Design a binder for this molecule. Structure first.
Ligand SMILES: CC(C)CCOP(=O)(O)OP(=O)(O)O
Ligand SMILES: CC(C)CCOP(=O)(O)OP(=O)(O)O
Ligand SMILES: [Mg+2]
Ligand SMILES: [Mg+2]
Ligand SMILES: [Mg+2]
Ligand SMILES: [Mg+2]
Ligand SMILES: [Mg+2]
Ligand SMILES: [Mg+2]
Ligand SMILES: [Mg+2]
Lengths: 138, 138
């Protein structure tokens, strides 16, 4: 029961980002970014690339730090505290399309225009966007 | 062995920040900021205020998130991995002077001018400044 580090990735593709619905004890069915737990020894950029590859099959590059958010999940099966480091990234091959590589954790990935985001967003993401955060400018 | 979250605080005082030489198995004798481990359920701001109080006796306000750095310490007696969340702040009372509340962890605290910093900086802090990071503007 300590805070744990997650990296989440904004894959900027045109005016769109990649989101998919979680299959999870936490935030089930809400739209969230690809990402996951930072491994011991791993840089943010390597973790971003690796998690995105594991979850979506996509090859990304130009990983750049955006910000960090503190996410305490009060009403969870087990009390959870995650510190979320956000990374922006772009596709290596601009023609690539995601695949749902981990259907046990995600309903599927799709591109969503920044101006037409889906709902409900995973609540840390809703709160981050509600603050005015924009990965296309930040 | 997993990554652990720490909060470090830039206490801004005129043109100067608070630094002290570490007593520690990691970065011993290098100049570092006040800070410490984030506790479960705690916000970055609460942790910042608590750690500066525990370590320096100083009272800080106007905390603002700056950035996050990924600090892997493979050469440590026990390998360590800290994700370090930077917070800027200022003294409630600018005349208040630091006290070395944990002499077992620090040689002592002092104000150092941004333009004339001591050496050696704890290398996460030197890497951060080498990036062009400035806690007064940022
Ligand atoms: C609660 C959570 C969003 C923090 C960790 O993110 P995640 O579920 O995607 O973690 P993993 O991909 O590593 O399984
Ligand atoms: C080493 C650093 C990046 C993170 C740990 O900071 P710290 O040594 O001050 O931790 P404590 O205050 O708890 O002793
Ligand atoms: Mg563009
Ligand atoms: Mg994972
Ligand atoms: Mg994953
Ligand atoms: Mg995941
Ligand atoms: Mg300390
Ligand atoms: Mg501590
Ligand atoms: Mg401490």
């Amino acid at each position: 029961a300590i805070p744990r580090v997650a990296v989440v990735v904004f894959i900027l593709n045109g005016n769109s980002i990649l989101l998919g619905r979680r299959r999870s004890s936490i935030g089930n069915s809400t739209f969230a970014l690809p990402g996951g737990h930072l491994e011991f020894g791993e840089s943010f950029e390597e973790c971003a690339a690796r998690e995105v590859m594991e979850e979506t099959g996509l090859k990304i590059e130009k990983m750049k730090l955006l910000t960090v958010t503190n996410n305490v999940f009060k009403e969870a099966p087990t009390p959870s505290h995650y510190v979320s480091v956000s990374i922006r990234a772009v596709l290596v091959d601009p023609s690539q399309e995601p695949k749902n590589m981990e259907p046990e954790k995600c309903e599927g990935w799709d591109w969503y225009d920044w101006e037409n985001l889906p709902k409900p967003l995973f609540w840390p993401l809703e709160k981050l966007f509600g603050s005015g955060f924009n990965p296309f400018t930040h």
